[PDB]
């Protein structure tokens, strides 16, 4: 029963895990949960273990935790999180407290990668894999809308996985008591301005990541959506009247009433100084990288490149492989914390 489990203090937290998981060491502790590295003695491989403490404790944690468990079963792709295991040490719904998630151990997140100079081979391979993952989600009917470096992980061999499935179709009120601050620098204008969106909402986030890889700074920092919008228009320019007409008349009022900005060309935004461009190879790849940035970092989604088109772009297309690109492949729920506990328990136990 519970002799299948042991308890060890990993930093501040107590981890109670199956005895197959050995030599726990803390990686991360924050909003989602606490993560540790372990050796899995049954599979003879290194794994990451994420602890969710009482994920049913409010409707935000609860909706996220449930969505993640369910959506895992709708995705089969090497660039998206796969679970090796999920378990709870508690034996009844009454006692049920914690869910543990187990997956392949990765070496770093894309935050650490951004702090490094990458050659064009590594940058384009990372972007290629991000797009493969996003296409897989899109073909499953999942539009992410919150892709960001901290939820993307890599191995030393430059292989990449996306860890999370983004925002609810309808989220509504996401209030929580915490110092845990959500990072929104990578969210599309559609998201920021509460517009309609389609698949290429996620192309804006890839743009913000690719731009950050090149600049080694956040493109669009800011305390809040106001700051963020200002940083967007200062660099890309005020968007055309055409785009304003698609805004709610009240956001439209705010946006159309900001100071106008001409906006900078992509050469200015991403000068030659930032690029590997010594050899003829690297000069050409430098212009192709800028060309792709200029098509992804477009405010109007009707003018922004699609996933399928980004995969056909010469900067990316050198990696193109039908098997990875054309690999074949809930949100409307509002519950009390009592009902969520049950829904999550049934999914962990696999009761239904
Ligand atoms: C969104 S947060 C998250 N959730 C999961 C997850 C895990 C299991 C699941 F089933 C599902 C999800 C993961 C995950 C999944 C698979 N592998 C990993 N690996 C891993 C290995 C190294 C590493 C990181 C992550 C993240 C960053 C990291 C954190 C730390 N902690 C420190 O405090 C470092 C230095 C502190 N110093 C300033 C004093 C030290 C090394 C660090 N550098 N790189 C992490 N992540 C990070």
UniProtKB/Swiss-Prot annotation:
Q: Does the keyword Disulfide bond apply?
A: no
Q: Name one GO biological process term.
A: regulation of circadian rhythm
Q: Where does ATP bind?
A: 27-35, 50
Broad class of where this protein is predominantly found: cytoplasm
Classify the protein's membrane topology as the record does: Lipid-anchor
| Activity control note | Activated by threonine and tyrosine phosphorylation by two dual specificity kinases, MAP2K4 and MAP2K7. MAP2K7 phosphorylates MAPK10 on Thr-178 causing a conformational change and a large increase in Vmax. MAP2K4 then phosphorylates Tyr-180 resulting in a further increase in Vmax. Inhibited by dual specificity phosphatases, such as DUSP1. Inhibited by HDAC9.
Question: Which residues carry the post-translational modification Phosphothreonine, per the record?
Answer: 178
Q: Note the subunit structure.
A: Interacts with MAPKBP1. Interacts with MAPK8IP1/JIP-1 and MAPK8IP3/JIP-3/JSAP1. Interacts with SPAG9/MAPK8IP4/JIP4. Interacts with HDAC9. Interacts with ARRB2; the interaction enhances MAPK10 activation by MAP3K5. Interacts with SARM1. Interacts with JUND; interaction is inhibited in the presence of MEN1.
The name under which this protein is listed is: Mitogen-activated protein kinase 10
Q: Which organism is it from?
A: Homo sapiens (Human)
Gene expressing this chain: MAPK10
Residues represented out of the complete protein: 44 to 402 of 464
């Amino acid at each position: 029963v519970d002799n299948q489990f042991y308890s060890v203090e990993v930093g501040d937290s107590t981890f109670t895990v199956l005895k197959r998981y050995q030599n726990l060491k803390p990686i991360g502790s924050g909003a989602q949960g606490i993560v540790c590295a372990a050796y899995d003695a049954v599979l003879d491989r290194n794994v990451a273990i994420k602890k969710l403490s009482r994920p049913f404790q409010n409707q935000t944690h609860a909706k996220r935790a449930y969505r993640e468990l369910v959506l895992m079963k709708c995705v089969n792709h090497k660039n998206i999180i796969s679970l090796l295991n999920v378990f709870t040490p508690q034996k009844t719904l009454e006692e049920f407290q914690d869910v543990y998630l187990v997956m392949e151990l990765m070496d770093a997140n894309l935050c650490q990668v951004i702090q490094m100079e990458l050659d064009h081979e590594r940058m384009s391979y990372l972007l290629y894999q991000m797009l493969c993952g996003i296409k897989h989600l899109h073909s499953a009917g999942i539009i992410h809308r919150d892709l960001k470096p901290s939820n993307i992980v890599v191995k030393s061999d430059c292989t990449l996985k996306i860890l999370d499935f983004g925002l609810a179709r309808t989220a509504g009120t996401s209030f929580m008591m915490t110092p845990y601050v959500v990072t929104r620098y990578y969210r599309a204008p559609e998201v920021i301005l509460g517009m309609g969106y389609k698949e290429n909402v996620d192309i804006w986030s890839v743009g913000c990541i690719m731009g950050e890889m090149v600049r080694h700074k956040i493109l669009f920092p800011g305390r809040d959506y106001i700051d963020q919008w200002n940083k967007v228009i200062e660099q890309l320019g005020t968007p055309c009247p055409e785009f304003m007409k698609k805004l709610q008349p009240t956001v439209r009022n705010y946006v159309e009433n900001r100071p106008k900005y001409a906006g900078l060309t992509f050469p200015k935004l991403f000068p030659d100084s930032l690029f590997p461009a010594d050899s003829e190879h690297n000069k050409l790849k430098a212009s192709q990288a800028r060309d792709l940035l200029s098509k992804m970092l477009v405010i109007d989604p009707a003018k922004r490149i699609s996933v399928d088109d980004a995969l056909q772009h010469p900067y990316i297309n050198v990696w193109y492989d039908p098997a990875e690109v054309e690999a074949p492949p809930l949100d409307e729920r509002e519950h009390t914390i009592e009902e969520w506990k049950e829904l999550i328990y049934k999914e962990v136990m696999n009761s239904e």
